[PDB]
Swiss-Prot record, chain A:
Residues of the full protein shown: 203 to 451 of 902
UniProt name for this protein: Gamma-tubulin complex component 2
Protein's organism: Homo sapiens
Cell wall biogenesis/degradation among keywords: no
Intracellular or extracellular location(s): Cytoplasm, Cytoskeleton, Microtubule organizing center, Centrosome
Effect of R90C: In CDCBM15; uncertain significance
GO molecular function ontology, one term from the record: gamma-tubulin binding
Function, in words: Component of the gamma-tubulin ring complex (gTuRC) which mediates microtubule nucleation. The gTuRC regulates the minus-end nucleation of alpha-beta tubulin heterodimers that grow into microtubule protafilaments, a critical step in centrosome duplication and spindle formation. Plays a role in neuronal migration.
Disease: Cortical dysplasia, complex, with other brain malformations 15: An autosomal recessive disorder characterized by global developmental delay, variably impaired intellectual development, speech delay, facial dysmorphism, microcephaly, and varying degrees of cortical malformations including pachygyria, thin corpus callosum and subcortical band heterotopia. Most patients have generalized seizures.
From Swiss-Prot, chain B:
Tissue: Ubiquitously expressed.
Entire protein: shown range: 245 to 567 of 907
Name of protein: Gamma-tubulin complex component 3
Subunit composition and interactions: Component of the gamma-tubulin ring complex (gTuRC) consisting of TUBGCP2, TUBGCP3, TUBGCP4, TUBGCP5 and TUBGCP6 and gamma-tubulin TUBG1 or TUBG2. TUBGCP2, TUBGCP3, TUBGCP4, TUBGCP5 and TUBGCP6 assemble in a 5:5:2:1:1 stoichiometry; each is associated with a gamma-tubulin, thereby arranging 14 gamma-tubulins in a helical manner. Gamma-tubulin at the first position is blocked by TUBGCP3 at the last position, allowing 13 protafilaments to grow into a microtubule.
Function (record text): Component of the gamma-tubulin ring complex (gTuRC) which mediates microtubule nucleation. The gTuRC regulates the minus-end nucleation of alpha-beta tubulin heterodimers that grow into microtubule protafilaments, a critical step in centrosome duplication and spindle formation.
Name of the coding gene: TUBGCP3
Compartments where found: Cytoplasm, Cytoskeleton, Microtubule organizing center, Centrosome
UniProt similarity note: Belongs to the TUBGCP family.
Length: 231, 270
């Protein structure tokens, strides 16, 4: 009953429940609604709080939509790139489970006012806003293999002057392209093409202009210059 | 209404969140000596809105370019600090009063005075034309402003000097949005146009014809010739000139060598 509760103290109750909301666990006041996740706070709360709470929650919704990309895109029906892109996108969620641990401990001592929260999460509101834009531009147009590596070379060039969201999208591409580059090492120094899922740029067949054919979709758009010398 | 209650709401009006409500933050009792000081203090928060709307309206559309991002992403490093000050001020409210705030927030009444008037002078400018309208704020002399804006220029002009160092050493310009002042046409007379509109102010009109000539000299050296390979800033353009062009004649006089064709075009065609 936060309506019949004092002003300066109920803020310390929201910042406790608010921390749980960042984790994604249903809180006491700041609850979640069934599914882009939309929340509800309370009908009877101070106007100068809800208008401030609703400014933080866009880091919860951008997390209830990245954890749902990790627990999904790790299946075997997607290839060896939509896997590594979902692992290197899981090391980050761990580093966000710590930045909410340091706050759960610094709040015990009373040193965490709501106005103090809106400052500490500023970097965790910008990182979780890049991973929640690749996880929606990889599912918009179904990408697996090469086309999910062309996107991570253009979403990394569009941020050519940010330097805080380019050191990130250069960590995803540098990690979501090792499995693609470990079969290329086998199709360069040798002739064997493993590629269990149909994702590599070159596919074999069963007098020789029809055996190996360049596939047009799965070209990483940064090997486009040498799409011929590879084959 | 106690003075402490006003100190509670003001620490929110500094952000946009509204006794004090929303163009002046008209406050609505209390003594006249209190309303007047609140009015000026509340209005500082209103400024913070005008600088927040721009970095939120233009962070939405994807047709603002590459310079318009390094600007819209350099108005945030100058806002996290404004969020650190609000952190400190809130920890002491648990003592500070109105007359004590005026000295605390007398300096961020200026930085939130230049930035809130730097985003209106450059409204419809995209690409390099924006990096040329945040440079027309350096001719001010005020040692506190000329050392703030001359830092935002050092971030906004980083993408511009990214095309330039690309269109000079490799001759491969690439900008889906038209920002660079070198516009291509889908090999000497055409396909290269000096864009009079997107030239930054900090490059003289003659310097802009030495880059369009170094880029053209390398782009033409690859396709047709069939061959593959501040003051320190002015020295870089000339260094890239007295080497590329001197090499273009050698390949045009030994393999065919721009000079070796002029002589050969006199022996036969004349």
């Amino acid at each position: 009953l936060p309506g019949t509760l004092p002003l300066a103290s109920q803020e310390s109750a929201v910042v406790e429940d608010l921390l749980y909301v960042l984790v994604g666990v249903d809180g006491r006041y700041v609850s979640a609604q069934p599914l882009s996740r939309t929340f509800l706070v309370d009908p009877n709360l101070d106007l100068s709080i809800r208008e401030l709470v609703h400014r933080i929650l866009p880091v919860a919704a951008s997390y209830s939509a990245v954890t749902r990309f990790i627990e999904e895109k790790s299946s075997f029906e997607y290839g060896q790139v939509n896997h590594a892109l979902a692992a290197a996108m899981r090391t980050l969620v761990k580093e966000h489970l710590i930045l909410v641990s340091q706050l759960e401990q610094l709040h015990r001592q009373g040193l965490l006012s709501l106005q103090k929260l809106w400052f500490y999460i500023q970097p965790a509101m910008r990182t979780m806003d890049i991973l929640a834009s690749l996880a929606t531009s990889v599912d918009k147009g179904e990408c697996l293999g090469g086309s999910t590596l062309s996107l991570l070379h253009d979403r990394s060039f569009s941020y050519t002057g940010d330097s805080q969201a380019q050191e990130l999208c250069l960590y995803l591409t540098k990690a979501a392209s090792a499995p693609y580059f470990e079969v290329l090492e086998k199709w360069i120094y040798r002739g064997i093409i493993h590629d269990p899922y149909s994702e590599f740029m070159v596919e074999e067949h069963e007098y020789w202009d029809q055996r190996y054919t360049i596939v047009q979709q799965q070209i990483p758009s940064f090997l486009q210059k040498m799409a011929d010398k590879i084959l | 209404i106690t003075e402490a209650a006003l100190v509670r709401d003001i620490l929110y009006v500094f952000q946009g969140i509204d006794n004090i409500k929303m163009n002046c933050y008209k406050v609505e009792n209390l003594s006249r000596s209190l309303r007047d000081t609140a009015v000026r203090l509340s209005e500082l928060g209103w400024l913070h809105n005008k600088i927040r709307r721009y970095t939120d309206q233009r962070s939405l559309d994807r047709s603002f370019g590459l310079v318009g991002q390094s600007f819209c992403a350099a108005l945030h490093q100058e806002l996290r600090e404004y969020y650190r000050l609000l952190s400190v001020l809130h920890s002491q409210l648990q003592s500070l009063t109105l007359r004590r705030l005026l000295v605390w927030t007398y300096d961020p009444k200026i930085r939130l005075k230049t930035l809130a008037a730097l985003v209106d002078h450059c409204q419809g400018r995209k690409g390099g034309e924006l990096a040329s309208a945040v440079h027309a704020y350096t001719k001010t002399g005020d040692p506190y402003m000329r050392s703030l804006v001359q830092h935002i220029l050092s971030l906004v002009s980083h993408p511009v000097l990214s095309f330039l160092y690309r269109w000079i050493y490799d001759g491969e310009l690439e900008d889906t949005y038209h920002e660079f002042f070198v516009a291509s046409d889908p090999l000497w007379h055409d396909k290269y146009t000096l864009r009079k509109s997107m030239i930054p102010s900090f490059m003289t009109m003659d310097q802009s014809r030495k880059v369009l000539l170094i880029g053209k000299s390398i782009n033409f050296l690859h396709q047709v010739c069939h061959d593959q390979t501040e003051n320190a800033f002015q020295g870089k353009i000339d260094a890239a000139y007295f080497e590329t062009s001197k090499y273009l004649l050698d390949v045009l006089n030994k393999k065919y060598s721009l000079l070796d064709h002029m002589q050969a075009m006199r022996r036969y065609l004349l």
